[PDB]
Design a binder for this molecule. Structure first.
Ligand SMILES: *[C@@H]1O[C@H](CO)[C@@H](O)[C@H](O)[C@H]1NC(C)=O
Ligand SMILES: *[C@@H]1O[C@H](CO)[C@@H](O)[C@H](O)[C@H]1NC(C)=O
Lengths: 48, 97
């Protein structure tokens, strides 16, 4: 969803979802976007 | 102009304007991750000058190339010349589209 939406909020009202009770494999996040900037400020994508 | 070097390596390539900002020891970006990666402990100089007179002509010129799809990151000073279609999902697909 978070990426196969269309109406991503304007920045004045940033929509915020909560992700819980699930298993995260960020390869879907990778293949859902021809990335331009993946500057992580938390955990490295390798160890994500 | 006051130093000596065991050996000197000169790597030359044309990239775009933002990519000059991208080229630096350990930066993020499909160039600094899949196309060229300098070592973290880099001891050298990066030269960049504008060339709109040799890489441009009327009706366009698409001669140059760059990689956005690699199976992993690029190790420092390591070339990855190859034409292999990136896998998506689980298909052993070999082709465009
Ligand atoms: C989301 O994924 C589905 C299945 O891959 C695809 O049909 C759809 O176009 C995608 N939506 C967006 C906005 O990427
Ligand atoms: C925020 O995201 C949720 C989950 O997709 C959606 O139901 C909600 O309508 C969104 N709000 C806005 C402002 O788009």
């Amino acid at each position: 969803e978070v990426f196969n939406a269309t109406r991503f909020a304007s920045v004045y009202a940033w929509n915020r979802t909560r992700i819980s009770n699930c298993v995260a494999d960020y390869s879907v996040l990778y293949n859902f976007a021809p990335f331009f900037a993946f500057k992580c400020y938390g955990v490295s994508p390798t160890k994500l | 102009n006051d130093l000596c070097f065991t050996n000197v390596y000169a790597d030359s390539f044309v990239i775009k304007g933002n990519e000059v900002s991208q080229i630096a020891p350990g930066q993020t970006g499909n160039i600094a991750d899949y196309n060229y990666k300098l070592p973290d402990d880099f001891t050298g100089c990066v030269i960049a000058w504008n060339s709109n007179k040799l890489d441009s002509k009327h009706s366009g010129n698409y001669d140059y190339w760059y990689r956005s799809f690699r199976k992993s990151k690029l190790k420092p000073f390591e070339r990855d010349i190859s034409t292999e279609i990136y896998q998506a999902g689980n298909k052993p697909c070999k082709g465009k589209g």
